[PDB]
Structure formats: structure tokens, C-alpha cells
């Protein structure tokens, strides 16, 4: 999704790596993991079992 809001609007030639947004987009992997291991409620939608 966050790769697309660059690519909706053809602003000049769009490349500019689109990468450095990943830090913007991170800690869903970290903080989401901390909060998990501290609280101990594991939300798994992939197996639909929590």
C-alpha cells in the first residue's frame, strides 16, 4: 500500500527508490512484537486462531 501512494500520481519520472519509507513503515515488526511478547496475547489471523 505505502509503495502505491507514490505511484498513483505520475510526478515527473517516479523512482527515488521508494525504499526509505520502510523505516517510516517499520516497528509494526518491532513494537508489534514487543507488545506481543510482553503482554502474551498472540493474535494470529493467518491460522485464524488467537
Amino acid at each position: 500500500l505505502s509503495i502505491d501512494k507514490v505511484l498513483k500520481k505520475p510526478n515527473r519520472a517516479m523512482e527515488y527508490d521508494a525504499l526509505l519509507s520502510i523505516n517510516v513503515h517499520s516497528n509494526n515488526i518491532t513494537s508489534g512484537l514487543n507488545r506481543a511478547i510482553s503482554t502474551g496475547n498472540w493474535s494470529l489471523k493467518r491460522f485464524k486462531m488467537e
Binding site: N11, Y16, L20, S21, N23, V24, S26, N27
Partner: protein, 522 residues
């Protein structure tokens, strides 16, 4: 807050000892609260946009490693700037950007606008522009003046190396401090001089770290870096003290920033000067910019580029302007004797070639002026004092922005003391503002004098009267060179042949959509 119903006591102690939790006053003994009851355990256009602002806010928030704190600090600023509707039509990033920015500025932390953009492809101007605009549409304090003494911390973090850098830190700090004191700090992009200090103290601690390796975190130019460096090499007691002992020498010596040193390179009682004056004139009739573009010496017309025609002259070296509606702007006028003079003259092509086009609604839209006090100025405390009426941004532009409402003029300021002044419709207002603020200039100095009379030269309307105000006096003031500024018919034939030659694609889609007008009903 209540009172003893007996002793009329004004002060209470809760008593937590015996697990009654009484509430009683020293002079009464009567309780007040026994039994201390104590607790335990959608769709709107504006509110939704506030939630979105939260999301784009959090997103950019930790990315720069900023406090969870400062974000909800700045989110409020966004809510505020929404009230004046400054945030409506401008690219959302540039808004959430500065709105997040000024916050961590006020807290005096390390974050930087140049650093702040690279989250985007954008230019550290557009963001800077929007930023400085929301400074106008709100009213903001002086506090956010950053120094390198803050940035050298975080810049030191990514330098790798070892514990020695902390030593280097103090080695750098007192360095930069003296550099601020030695007077060649002002009016420069802070992150650069910070990196310069780091390169120095690092070399002072005898390590090898390349310039590239420095600017990676410093986000400045190599050339800039060593330029500010070599600017440091020749400074006071630079040679003599550059050895050990670090610096126990706090002695400033002299102070000579390159600002007025270049004033020596080409080398009150000094009057501000008139650079240009902007005005307007209405011709009262609409013409064809294409048709007028046919015969002129000074003309260019490309609605694909700009919808109007260029008009200029060699003397008195004026441009002014022309519109399609038959109005115009006046530029290139150093005085009023030149302006209404030229303002009438540009109508001589028209009334010679084009429509009736009389001379109407002549008023100065702005006047430009500049001068120099010939001594240095300390801005860092200037705005820190007068930033109610002033603003100083090291990053964007070197000098200081001053806002005077009385009279209403913006005063552009520099280190050398050269002062450019405009945003005035009146020549007297210039000497008014310059006069009144000059005591602030004499107030801030480091170690002419007499204003004489406040008004010396004749007024503006005198020089406006020195030119005929009657819209029908033209041929009399016709330079006779404009009689020669008409090109012949053939020059318009082949010259227009070139114009349309290149413009048949622009007028192509123009008239093509003019056909789509028929396609509308279809």
C-alpha cells in the same frame, strides 16, 4: 476547598495511617469526608481528517526517532493551523512536515529541516517555503534558535570510532563555542559549521575520517565544508594556538566575518536607496496580445509559458508589464520621474498601433530600497529580542526577516549590515522605518551617527507631478525612439510567421478544444 462546619478551618489533612483514610483539619477534629469513595478499573468530516493527520503523523514520527511525546505535541499544532485554514490546499506532506517540525524545534532537540525532507524526493525548499508561510499565518515565538552545540551530539553518534569521541565532543564543543564567539558563525547553515567543528576536533584528536564520511551525516557539501574550514584557518589566534593545551584562550581578538570583508575587497548620515518601484496602470480597454505582439521592439508572448506579453525598454531601463484585460504593472523604475514617464511611453506603441488605451489608475504597488550601515550586526540576539517583529532562519536564506507594522514594511537583514528594504508603497515610509529601527541597529553592535532631518528630498507626489498626469499627454513625452520602436510590416509578417511557426501546436490544441466546445452538446 470546603470549610470545617465547626472550627471554620481552612486546611485539611487526610489520614492514611489506620486505613480509615479520614479527612480532618488540625483545628477542628471534625471529619468532613469519611468513607472516601474512590473508583477503580464516529463519522465526521473534520474528526476523520484529524485521525488521518494522526496516521501520517505517527508514520513520520518514529522514522526520525522523535519522542512519542513531541508528536502528540505537534498534532495539536496541526489542529491549530487547521483553524486558520492554512492547511487546506497545500501538499499535505509540507503541512504535516513543518507542523511536526516547530515542535521538536521548541523542545530544543536535534532534528533538522534538510534532514527532515529526505523522507521525500522533495527539495528542502517547498517544505521550507510552506514552513515559513505557516509562520506568517500563525504567530510564533523566538525560542527555536538551534546551535551546533546540540547537533554535534547526534552527529557524533554515527561517527563510529570509540570512547575518545566524547573527549572529542568536549574538544569540539568549546571549539564551536569560541567559533560562535569569534564572530564567523552567523548567517550560515548550522549543520555545516557543526560538521566542520567535528572534522577539526577529530583531527585535533588525530584520527583519519574523510570528508565524505563527515557529510554523510552532516548533509552538507564537501566544498562548503572545507570553505568554512579554510575560513577558520585564518581566524584570530588560529595559527598561534592550534597546538596543544586545547584552547585556554577565550580571547576573541578581532571579529571579521567575510560579509563586510568583501565590502573591503572591492574597496542616519547614509540614505537608503531606491532599487525599483512597482506600480499599475489600467488602459480601460482589452486588446489582442497576439496583435500587439506583432509590432514591437521589446516583446515576447507565449501563453504556453506565460499568458501575457513582455514589454521593456533600453532607457530608462524599465520593463513594467502588460495584461490581456488592458491593465499593467510597472517595474524597472528607479524613481517616479522614470515610472509615469515610462508608464505613458509603453502606451505609445498601442495608441500608435493598438487601441485607445488611456493612462488610468497609476499607483505604486511596491517600492524597493536597500542600504548598508557599514558595521556588523548580531542577529542571533536581535530576533531573540525583536522576533516578535522579526524572524531568523539560518537554513533558508542567510539574513534575518523583520516585520514592521508601523509603517508596514518587511526589513531584510544581513551580517555585514547591508539592509534591503521593500514592501512599501511610499518613499517616506522607507526613511520612516529605516530611521526608527536604526536605534535598534546602534543598540546591537560589537566593539552614520546623525539622522540629520527625517525627510530631506521632495516627496513622491512631487516626482509624480514632474511627469504629466493627463492620460492624453503622450506624443509630447514620446521619446521619438518609440517612433523607431515600431518594426516594419514585413518584420511582423515573417516574425509572426516564426511565432505561429512554433505556436501552431499550442494554438493547435487551443482551437482543437474550441472544437470540443461543439463536441459538448454532442
Amino acid at each position: 476547598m470546603p470549610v470545617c462546619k465547626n472550627c471554620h478551618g481552612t486546611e485539611f489533612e487526610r489520614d492514611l495511617s489506620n486505613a480509615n483514610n479520614d479527612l480532618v483539619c488540625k483545628a477542628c477534629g471534625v471529619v468532613s469526608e469519611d468513607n472516601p469513595i474512590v473508583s477503580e478499573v464516529a463519522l465526521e468530516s473534520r474528526e476523520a481528517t484529524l485521525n488521518n493527520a494522526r496516521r501520517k503523523l505517527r508514520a513520520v514520527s518514529y522514522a526520525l526517532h522523535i519522542p512519542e511525546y513531541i508528536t502528540d505535541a505537534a498534532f495539536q499544532w496541526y489542529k491549530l493551523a487547521l483553524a486558520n485554514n492554512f492547511v487546506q490546499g497545500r501538499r499535505s506532506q509540507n503541512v504535516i512536515a513543518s507542523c511536526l517540525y516547530v515542535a521538536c524545534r521548541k523542545e530544543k532537540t536535534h532534528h533538522m529541516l534538510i534532514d527532515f525532507s529526505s523522507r521525500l524526493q522533495v527539495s528542502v525548499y517547498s517544505i521550507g517555503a510552506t514552513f515559513l508561510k505557516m509562520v506568517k499565518k500563525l504567530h510564533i515565538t523566538e525560542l527555536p534558535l538551534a546551535d551546533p552545540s546540540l547537533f554535534i551530539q547526534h552527529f557524533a553518534e554515527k561517527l563510529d570510532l570509540a570512547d575518545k569521541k566524547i573527549k572529542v565532543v568536549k574538544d569540539a564543543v568549546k571549539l564551536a563555542q569560541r567559533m560562535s564567539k569569534d564572530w564567523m558563525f552567523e548567517g550560515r547553515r548550522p549543520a555545516g559549521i557543526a560538521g566542520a567543528c567535528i572534522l577539526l576536533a577529530c583531527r585535533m584528536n588525530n584520527l583519519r575520517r574523510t570528508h565524505t564520511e563527515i557529510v554523510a551525516v552532516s548533509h552538507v557539501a564537501e566544498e562548503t565544508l572545507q570553505q568554512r574550514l579554510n575560513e577558520f584557518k585564518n581566524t584570530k589566534a588560529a595559527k598561534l594556538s592550534v597546538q596543544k593545551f586545547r584552547e585556554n584562550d577565550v580571547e576573541d581578538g578581532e571579529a571579521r566575518p567575510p560579509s563586510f570583508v568583501k565590502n573591503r575587497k572591492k574597496e542616519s548620515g547614509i540614505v537608503p536607496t531606491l532599487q525599483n518601484i512597482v506600480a499599475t496602470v489600467t488602459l480601460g480597454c482589452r486588446l489582442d496580445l497576439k496583435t500587439v505582439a506583432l509590432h514591437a521592439r521589446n516583446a515576447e508572448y507565449n501563453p504556453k509559458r506565460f499568458a501575457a506579453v513582455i514589454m521593456r525598454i533600453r532607457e530608462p531601463k524599465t520593463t513594467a508589464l502588460i495584461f490581456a484585460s488592458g491593465k499593467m504593472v510597472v517595474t524597472g523604475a528607479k524613481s517616479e520621474d522614470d515610472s509615469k514617464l515610462a508608464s505613458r511611453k509603453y502606451a505609445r506603441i498601442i495608441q500608435k498601433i493598438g487601441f485607445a488605451a488611456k493612462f488610468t489608475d497609476f499607483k505604486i504597488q511596491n517600492i524597493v530600497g536597500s542600504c548598508d550601515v557599514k558595521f556588523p550586526i548580531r542577529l542571533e540576539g536581535l530576533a531573540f529580542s525583536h522576533g516578535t517583529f522579526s524572524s531568523y532562519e539560518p537554513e533558508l536564506f542567510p539574513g534575518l526577516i523583520y516585520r514592521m507594522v508601523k509603517p508596514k514594511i518587511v526589513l531584510l537583514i544581513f551580517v555585514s549590515g547591508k539592509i534591503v528594504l521593500t514592501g512599501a508603497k511610499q518613499r517616506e515610509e522607507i526613511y520612516q522605518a529605516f530611521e526608527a529601527i536604526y536605534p535598534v541597529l546602534s543598540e546591537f553592535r560589537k566593539m552614520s551617527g546623525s539622522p540629520r532631518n527625517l525627510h530631506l528630498l521632495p516627496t513622491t507626489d512631487t516626482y509624480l507631478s514632474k511627469v504629466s498626469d493627463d492620460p492624453d499627454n503622450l506624443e509630447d513625452v514620446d521619446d521619438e525612439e518609440l517612433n523607431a520602436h515600431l518594426l516594419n510590416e514585413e518584420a511582423s509578417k515573417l516574425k509572426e510567421r516564426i511565432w505561429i511557426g512554433l505556436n501552431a501546436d499550442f494554438l493547435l490544441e487551443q482551437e482543437s478544444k474550441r472544437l470540443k466546445q461543439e463536441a459538448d452538446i454532442a
